[PDB]
Design a binder for this molecule. Structure first.
Ligand SMILES: COc1ccc(C(=O)Nc2c(Cl)cncc2Cl)cc1OC1CCCC1
Ligand SMILES: [Mg+2]
Ligand SMILES: [Zn+2]
Length: 323
């Protein structure tokens, strides 16, 4: 409507408010934002993706995120997808990626947490869930999200890549699997050490645009790009960041409650009777988010300085809320 259209004028901006798009799209944010992103970038045209087919796939994908899970629902997928869309336009990365890689990244963002049950890999492993047994305790959820996303492409009424070549579809699938498996937090520390090595030997053309020799280098920047998007909540305006915080805490505390009911050990940031929301966000920024974004900023400097300044300001707000 008039409000949804005013809000999507920010489609290519970090300042986009996804909670507002959700309000004006019948709580179908993922479908609305993916369709806006694909039109903006001409991906339907480029890959002969039918409009009805793409919408039918996106609405089914969306319906497979659980609406009664406080944080890992379709609003988070929508946010990571839109955030990824903006990152891909960063001046330092201009003309580096093929249209195929741009398509895989945004697609990956969208499916990256589908059918998330609101509990962590460790909880599924310690409770002997069917998923942990299925995936042998390794990147349990991530493998599951990929499995569902790619499974949904099997029916013809839903195959949005049916017009890619075979070499393209295979190249796509490889890239998407690689990006989503990289969202597993147990991989965070080595992805970052690898990102730091990429900065160390960064080469740029005369116009301030990164030089990415082969596929190895590009997929490395893309995995890291979806990972930053996944970890982008604290880099957004304070107003958005706080709603995201409320949401991750509601989910984590629910798991905490399930751990207790089952008499399991409770992870300190999941225990609602003792955990500080404010200290936890400060630690989250100091030990995970800042270290990561600081490195992303070096890679694409100075494109992410605004983001780094917002992150620091948001850090200081949570610190001042701590007695
Ligand atoms: C707004 O706050 C948060 C947002 C996201 C996450 C987070 O861990 N996300 C995440 C998860 Cl839960 C699993 N895999 C990958 C990612 Cl990026 C964690 C957040 O806060 C932490 C967890 C509770 C205390 C601070
Ligand atoms: Mg995830
Ligand atoms: Zn996620």
């Amino acid at each position: 409507e008039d409000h949804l259209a005013k809000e999507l004028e920010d489609l290519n901006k970090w300042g986009l408010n996804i909670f507002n798009v959700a309000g004006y799209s019948h709580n179908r944010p993922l479908t609305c934002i993916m369709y806006a992103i694909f039109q903006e970038r001409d991906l339907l045209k480029t890959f002969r993706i039918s409009s009805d087919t793409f919408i039918t796939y996106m609405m089914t994908l969306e319906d497979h995120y659980h609406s009664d899970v406080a944080y890992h629902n379709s609003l988070h997928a929508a946010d990571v997808a839109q955030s990824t869309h903006v990152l891909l336009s960063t001046p330092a990365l201009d003309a580096v990626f093929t249209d195929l890689e741009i398509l895989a990244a945004i697609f990956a963002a969208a499916i990256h947490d589908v059918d998330h049950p609101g509990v962590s890999n460790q909880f599924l492993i310690n409770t002997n869930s069917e998923l942990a047994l299925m995936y042998n305790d390794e990147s349990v959820l991530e493998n599951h999200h990929l499995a569902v996303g790619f499974k949904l492409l099997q029916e013809e009424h839903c195959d949005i890549f049916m017009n890619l070549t075979k070499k393209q579809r295979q190249t796509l699938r490889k890239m998407v699997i690689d990006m989503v498996l990289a969202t597993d937090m147990s991989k965070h520390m080595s992805l970052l050490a690898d990102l730091k090595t990429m900065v160390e030997t960064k080469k740029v053309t005369s116009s301030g645009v990164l030089l990415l020799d082969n596929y190895t280098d590009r997929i490395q920047v893309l995995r890291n790009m979806v990972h930053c998007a996944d970890l982008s909540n604290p880099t957004k305006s304070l107003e958005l960041y706080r709603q995201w915080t409320d949401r991750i805490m509601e989910e984590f505390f629910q798991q905490g409650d399930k751990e207790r009911e089952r008499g399991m050990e409770i992870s300190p940031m999941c225990d609602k009777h003792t955990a500080s929301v404010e200290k936890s966000q400060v630690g989250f920024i100091d030990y995970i988010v800042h270290p990561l974004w600081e490195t992303w900023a070096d890679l694409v400097q100075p494109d992410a300085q605004d983001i780094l300044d917002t992150l620091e300001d948001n850090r200081n707000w949570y610190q001042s809320m701590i007695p």
